[PDB]
Design a protein around this ligand. Structure first.
Ligand SMILES: [Zn+2]
Ligand SMILES: [Zn+2]
Ligand SMILES: [Zn+2]
Length: 297
């Protein structure tokens, strides 16, 4: 059960900090941004303390980790040539960083937002951006994230993902990241028919491309397109369904990353749920009082 969470690189520990945090949640994998998620803005490869972080991951059994590219990257942009160009450039640097970790195979990327050009146009730009980024001999894939359909996001259906993959010439370097919150919010019934939804994914996109799993419950109903994550089992997806995904027989080798919200109503401040959530999902039974246990620790 390859399972972990979003963690942080603090600097100057950087990578060592990510790995300690993950270890402290009892995590077997984890996910990092290379930098702040909301900007671009990055320390050189030399300052990521990779040797030390890799040493601590060996010692505590972590073999693979995930990278998520910052979410301001929009290679779907058609009106500001420099935003498109900025995304190509950064992805090129990001592949270099990630490569420079030894042991991240994947960079999660929000495909893009068409921001008024409509999906077709946005998707053609993403193909174009990707075709400018990718090399046939790069050693890390880009994992296109399943999007919730919020605002003008492209990647909101499997058909949109597949369309992007078919567009790019080095598509062997493309994977996908299946986020449970997003797919639910985008209207797929992963609650009483995840097996069906997986089959569809396999037909449209192909299950071998499903290389990252984001395990989030959701604050909103199916189809809401709101991308508001919730703690495991306390949302609209619920424990049975999330548990089923986590332990799915076809997904044993794929790393599961919780991106669930920290806990602490409402003037504090503000505790990570990952340790307890992970163990609850291992235990196979819903802990009605998990939120109150998360608050003390
Ligand atoms: Zn994401
Ligand atoms: Zn996600
Ligand atoms: Zn989300």
């Amino acid at each position: 059960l390859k399972i972990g969470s979003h963690v942080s690189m603090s600097g100057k520990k950087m990578l060592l900090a990510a790995s300690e945090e993950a270890v402290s949640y009892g995590a077997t994998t984890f996910m990092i941004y290379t930098g702040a998620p909301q900007n671009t803005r990055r320390k050189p490869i030399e300052e990521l303390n990779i040797e030390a972080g890799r040493k601590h991951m060996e010692q505590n059994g972590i073999e693979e980790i995930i990278i998520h590219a910052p979410y301001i990257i929009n290679v779907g942009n058609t009106t500001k040539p420099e935003t498109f160009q900025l995304g190509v450039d950064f992805l090129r640097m990001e592949i270099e960083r990630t490569s420079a970790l030894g042991v991240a195979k994947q960079i999660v990327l929000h495909p893009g937002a068409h921001v008024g050009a409509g999906a077709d146009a946005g998707i053609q730009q993403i193909i174009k951006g990707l075709n400018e980024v990718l090399t046939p001999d790069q050693t890390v894939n880009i994992a296109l994230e399943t999007m919730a359909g919020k605002g003008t996001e492209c990647g909101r259906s499997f058909e949109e993902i597949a369309k992007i993959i078919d567009g790019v010439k080095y598509n062997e370097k493309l994977s996908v990241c299946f986020d449970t919150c997003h797919t639910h919010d985008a209207g797929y019934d992963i609650v009483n028919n995840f097996d069906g939804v997986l089959n569809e994914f396999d037909k449209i996109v192909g299950i071998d491309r499903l290389q990252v799993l984001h395990i989030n419950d959701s604050k909103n109903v199916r189809g809401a397109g709101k991308d508001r994550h919730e703690n495991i089992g306390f949302g609209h997806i619920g424990y049975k369904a999330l548990h089923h995904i986590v332990h799915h027989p076809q997904l044993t080798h794929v790393p599961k990353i919780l991106e669930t919200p920290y806990v602490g109503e409402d003037k504090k401040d503000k505790k990570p749920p990952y340790k307890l959530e992970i163990e609850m999902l291992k235990n196979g039974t819903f802990d009605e009082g998990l939120l109150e246990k998360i608050k003390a620790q």
